[PDB]
Amino acid sequence: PIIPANLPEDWQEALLPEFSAPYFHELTDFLRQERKEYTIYPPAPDVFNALRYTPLGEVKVLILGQDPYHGPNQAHGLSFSVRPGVRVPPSLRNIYKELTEDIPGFVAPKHGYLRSWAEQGVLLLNAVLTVRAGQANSHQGKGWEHFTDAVIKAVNAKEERVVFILWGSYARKKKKLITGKNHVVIESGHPSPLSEQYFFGTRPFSKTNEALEKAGRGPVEWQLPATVTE
DSSP: OOSOTTOOHHHHHHHHHHHTSHHHHHHHHHHHHHHHHSOEESOGGGTTHHHHHSOGGGOOEEEEESSOOOSTTOOSSSSSOOOTTSOOOHHHHHHHHHHHHHSTTOOOOSSOOOHHHHTTTEEEEESSOOEETTBTTTTTTSSHHHHHHHHHHHHHTOSSOOEEEEEHHHHHGGGGGOOOTTOEEEEEOOSSTTSGGGTTTOOHHHHHHHHHHHTTOOOOOOOOOSSOOO
């Protein structure tokens, strides 16, 4: 139980202090109990999928969301992404509009599934990793934020350049944690339709690849497969 199931070895090094800490045991007890009274998203085996697909040593970019999508079949343990065959949410649709204008030759897919960004170093981290069906922010301040702050600080600890993409007011509160000399913070309003005029024209995807390239790192290939792949 103490260390979750199929986790890369660098995240074990990094996050053992978190996994064995009191606040984390109380959080998992909370979740055990929440899951017998409510449907909680994502499923238990997916909660840490961001860390599975993107080992600490392969992190190039960190794209922070708030909490998981809270409807059926959406959330699968990654920020912003949804499962194949599920309608692309409003924020992801705008992400795609901006990608088509920012990355010459990017072709928007019909799906919302972003595992291919994860499998190439994009850490798709929500600040809060679980939720009650129907209820946004229902697991806010139960312990996930101590945990995901510690994911964030471990990524900040890396010598090699990481681009931290902070979209919207919640995310931008983490700017203070990014102190590493080689890191880059790309900030703007959130892709959400409520705030989209502060997101369009910001070119976060090209600035990211430009920053990586300056530090001798490889760019992200933002193109998604046309069909997926679960």
